[PDB]
Design an enzyme around this catalytic site. Sequence first.
Site, PDB file in Angstrom:
ATOM      1  N   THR A 150      42.086  44.787  37.499  1.00 55.87           N
ATOM      2  CA  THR A 150      40.833  44.576  36.742  1.00 55.87           C
ATOM      3  C   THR A 150      41.025  45.193  35.378  1.00 55.87           C
ATOM      4  OG1 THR A 150      39.577  44.385  38.780  1.00 55.87           O
ATOM      5  CG2 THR A 150      38.416  45.312  36.792  1.00 55.87           C
ATOM      6  N   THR A 151      40.549  44.505  34.385  1.00 55.84           N
ATOM      7  CA  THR A 151      40.414  45.056  33.069  1.00 55.84           C
ATOM      8  C   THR A 151      39.018  44.704  32.584  1.00 55.84           C
ATOM      9  OG1 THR A 151      42.859  44.692  32.711  1.00 55.84           O
ATOM     10  CG2 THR A 151      41.366  45.053  30.834  1.00 55.84           C
ATOM     11  N   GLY A 206      43.575  48.107  34.472  1.00 53.80           N
ATOM     12  CA  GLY A 206      44.184  47.630  33.243  1.00 53.80           C
ATOM     13  C   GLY A 206      43.797  48.482  32.050  1.00 53.80           C
ATOM     14  N   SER A 228      47.424  43.898  38.472  1.00 55.05           N
ATOM     15  CA  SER A 228      46.153  43.745  39.144  1.00 55.05           C
ATOM     16  C   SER A 228      45.109  43.069  38.276  1.00 55.05           C
ATOM     17  CB  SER A 228      45.649  45.092  39.562  1.00 55.05           C
ATOM     18  OG  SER A 228      46.260  45.446  40.818  1.00 55.05           O
TER      19      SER A 228
END
Lengths: 244, 228
Positions: free
Chosen positions: B1-2, B131, B169
């Site tokens: 995830t970012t 992220g 991810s």
Amino acid sequence: FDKYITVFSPEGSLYQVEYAFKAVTYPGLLTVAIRCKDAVLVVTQHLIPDRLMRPDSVTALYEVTPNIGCCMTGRAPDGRALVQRAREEASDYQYRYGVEIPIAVLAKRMGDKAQVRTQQAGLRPMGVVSTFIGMDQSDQDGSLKPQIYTVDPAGWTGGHIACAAGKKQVEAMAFLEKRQKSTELDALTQKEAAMIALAALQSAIGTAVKAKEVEVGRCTAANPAFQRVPNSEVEEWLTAVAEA
Amino acid sequence: TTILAVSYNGGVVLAADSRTSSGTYVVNRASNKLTKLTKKIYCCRSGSAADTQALAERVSNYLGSYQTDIGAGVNVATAANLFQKMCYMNRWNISAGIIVAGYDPINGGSVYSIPSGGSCVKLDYALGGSGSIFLYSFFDANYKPGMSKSECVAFCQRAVAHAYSRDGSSGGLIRTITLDADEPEDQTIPWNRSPYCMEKDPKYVTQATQNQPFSSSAKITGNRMSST
């Protein structure tokens, strides 16, 4: 002994519920609601005799959710309380089901709430008639139809084409029945409707109204959110009534 | 995830990649991690989808009730405060990085970070997700504040792209939304028009020279590409 508690009289009637209905008319205010093909309006009197009272602060119109308005008629603080409960009901419902509460369900749940106060002793029935208006999506086409649901202190819930509550609710109704033999009310326009509503209010209260002595709420298929109609536009309808 | 959010004059941008991963497999490659709380207030969610969806739905609910009750708009601070409360009450049982960002007329655009411990910090911009560790230097180096809406959108897209080019991810789309006085503009950059990736950066086109052919010299030539 039966007049003061929620037990049946010998005629099979609940006095405290009948008297709660008188609480509806006691204030002397009338409300009218009406649906047209693509909108629903609710008009209620908004009387500020006290020159020093702040008109925008007192209202009988309330957003319940963005898509449901209601007008309470009767004992004002009892109305305010039902609105709180409605709001809670609507919000608990959105949390549980992920969708905004349909207005006929909300009405039904508020009728359940009232009914309870008529069967459990020592809770005073709220002396109001609640009038929810809103749009309602149909399962066939997904089109929005306008709705008016009342709830009364007995818990009797009903959908309406037009409806009045409050002082002279009878002479208001009589006027709308009479105007329903002429026209078909669900084929009207938001203007022709509001005219009828306002004219019914005027007939009933025996006076011509000015814009600032009413307050009008609306939902429309185009803009489904419930909105206070601005005075400019109520003035124009009231002009359109005095003329034609 | 970012996930990230950035302030500009008069509003905020939120941005996120779209990937939800069960470790090393991508269960969802088009998740929406920009979750609406009110009209002009959003969160970005990171951590446990379950947890963050449950909180966002809860907070959005509370905030709609609250808006109907006070008959007026909600402040971003209120939304952040509620989020913080809930995140802190449940800090032991949830994995949840939030950013709450949005526009309200009193305070303009705001950004709050609510990281795992349930702190709530008001910032100019915020980063979250696995992220995010990749963007700190990117912001330190390349983010100047005072950007226009459009500059800020492009910068957040770049920033997400940089992050998800290195975080295994994060990935997929880049979703953004702007939130200011005007209507919210959501946007979705598909991966194949990402404004950055390693697979198209010219400085990563030459292959590392690992598979040298057997030679009579120490002079390094190239990888052995063919048997002959």
